Design an enzyme around this catalytic site. Structure first.
Site, short mmCIF file in Angstrom:
data_model
loop_
_atom_site.label_atom_id
_atom_site.label_comp_id
_atom_site.label_asym_id
_atom_site.label_seq_id
_atom_site.Cartn_x
_atom_site.Cartn_y
_atom_site.Cartn_z
N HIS A 222 0.81 -1.22 0.00
CA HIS A 222 0.00 0.00 0.00
C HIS A 222 0.85 1.28 0.00
O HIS A 222 0.28 2.38 -0.04
CB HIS A 222 -1.01 -0.01 1.16
CG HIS A 222 -0.42 0.22 2.52
ND1 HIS A 222 -0.46 -0.74 3.51
CD2 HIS A 222 0.18 1.30 3.07
CE1 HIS A 222 0.11 -0.26 4.61
NE2 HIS A 222 0.51 0.98 4.36
N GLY B 27 2.69 5.87 11.46
CA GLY B 27 3.77 5.85 10.49
C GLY B 27 4.76 4.70 10.64
O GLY B 27 5.87 4.74 10.09
N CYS C 21 4.15 1.57 9.58
CA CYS C 21 3.92 0.54 8.57
C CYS C 21 5.24 0.04 8.01
O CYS C 21 6.18 0.82 7.80
CB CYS C 21 3.04 1.07 7.43
SG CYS C 21 1.35 1.28 7.94
#
Lengths: 289, 283
Positions: free
Chosen positions: A38, A138, A140
């Site tokens: 993503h 943040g 990920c």
């Protein structure tokens, strides 16, 4: 103490991946950077992302990979399930011995939480029975791992925050744990349960450390234990679990179903001001030994 | 809300094994000096036990490599072994001494091999609840490792006692096999309050009430429940969380007094956690 693995071997693999206005963490092993696919989505895309369509429109140079100060040149890319694999022209000199493993609910691991490629903290984790992580993301693309004899087993990569505050992600082949998807849907973690086999292994650890106030003179059938434990939202205990605890049962002289009887009483009574003041379920029988 | 340790890689690269006779423990290798507990050379007379030692009495191992000791010296309860090789993995670092209630990460090591990392607080009674001797505690502030603790001994209640990296003990403990016990411990009040600010920031708000208290009336309440007394400096340190959440400190203290009397659920916990500092919560 719940201890995390020393994180240095993973710190040397953390990089920053930017695609458009989206930046997150990537894992740099040999000449491949692994990150959540993503990274190619622009928030609006997250409602109904068509990853095949979004990825065919990208070239190598759309991906900015930074390892500290150095930019890495992306020379190829590919998607494996929900992870993007960026081929770079430099093999990570700090690549540890590693393997990719898929874990099961109840298993523990360490997470190196990172922001924009830089390690921020490390903590010890269990995969919950509902396939989520109760973490601190943040972040990920941060990864979870165990280390066995200098070999790092990567088992988790962080993709999504669920509305309950918990975290969902994939193994390193990009396959999600649980029914979750990398799409902003109304998906929610199911009711979580306690990892019973882990509580029992910990109780065995308590006996081994010389604490046995919580024992009693009762035993239980496996089925009676499970009928009671389920009323406390405890996971059912299987014959496999009974077998797993066998060694700890031998080391302490306490039969597994006898420890089960103690657990039943602990759930009924609590701790009566004694101790942690909670039944701890994120140490595995392997961890306890 | 997860307790988080600092990434340990910068410290992992400094851990070595130190052997003196039949005693082996952990040492810290920074540039060309290895630091370890002086009791590796063991009512002791350390002055005299060290004069009798030579460089050949010390065997230092960095993984596979033996490091040759070329000088030895004592600083308080820390032994300093000069070695022939400077650690090429030496981080930017400082030696610092921390206060009771402050937190740090410990890299637990066995015979020079890092085993695990965990987050600690220095208890008000100067102990830590944690072959690990010589393992160190540390904070990291953007590329600089501040070493604050080195492990020296286990006390009979199962807790740990040690020194700063200049060999000064935390707590009324000595490096001798005499009888020693931790003082009665106390809950770190300013950390409990910081943790309550973290719960509010995380959407947990049920324990907030309409009331305020006085710094003195709280302290009489705190003294009775075995909680460290709150100071004006404690209130000042919590100011950033009072500004961010709109809950004044003596407001939150009213919440805490009410919790300490009636019970409770807060950040998925039942007891009040006291090993997060105000700095930890902001971070």
């Amino acid at each position: 103490r719940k201890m995390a693995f020393p994180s240095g071997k993973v710190e040397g693999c953390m990089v920053q991946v930017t695609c458009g206005t989206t930046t997150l963490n990537g894992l740099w092993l040999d000449d491949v950077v692994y990150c959540p696919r993503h990274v190619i989505c622009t928030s609006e895309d997250m409602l109904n992302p068509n990853y095949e369509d979004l990825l065919i429109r990208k070239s190598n140079h759309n991906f900015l990979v930074q390892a500290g100060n150095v930019q890495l040149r992306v020379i190829g890319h590919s998607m494996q399930n929900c992870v993007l694999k960026l081929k770079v022209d430099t093999a990570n000199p700090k690549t540890p011995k590693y393997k990719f493993v898929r874990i099961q609910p109840g298993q523990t691991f360490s997470v190196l939480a990172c922001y924009n490629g830089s390690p921020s903290g490390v903590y010890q984790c269990a995969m919950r029975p509902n396939f989520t992580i109760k973490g601190s993301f943040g972040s990920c693309g941060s990864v979870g791992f165990n280390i066995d004899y200098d070999c790092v087993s990567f088992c988790y990569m962080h993709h999504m925050e669920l509305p309950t505050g918990v975290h969902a992600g994939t193994d390193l082949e990009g396959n999600f744990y649980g029914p979750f998807v990398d799409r902003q849907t109304a998906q929610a973690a199911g009711t979580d349960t306690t990892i019973t086999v882990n509580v029992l292994a910990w109780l065995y650890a308590a006996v081994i450390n010389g604490d046995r106030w919580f024992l009693n003179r009762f035993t239980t059938t496996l089925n009676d234990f499970n009928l009671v434990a389920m009323k406390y939202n405890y996971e059912p205990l299987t014959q496999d679990h009974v077998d797993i605890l066998g060694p700890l049962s031998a080391q302490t002289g306490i039969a597994v179903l006898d420890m089960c009887a103690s657990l039943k009483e602990l759930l009924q009574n609590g701790m009566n001001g004694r101790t942690s003041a909670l039944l701890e379920d994120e140490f595995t029988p392997f961890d306890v030994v």
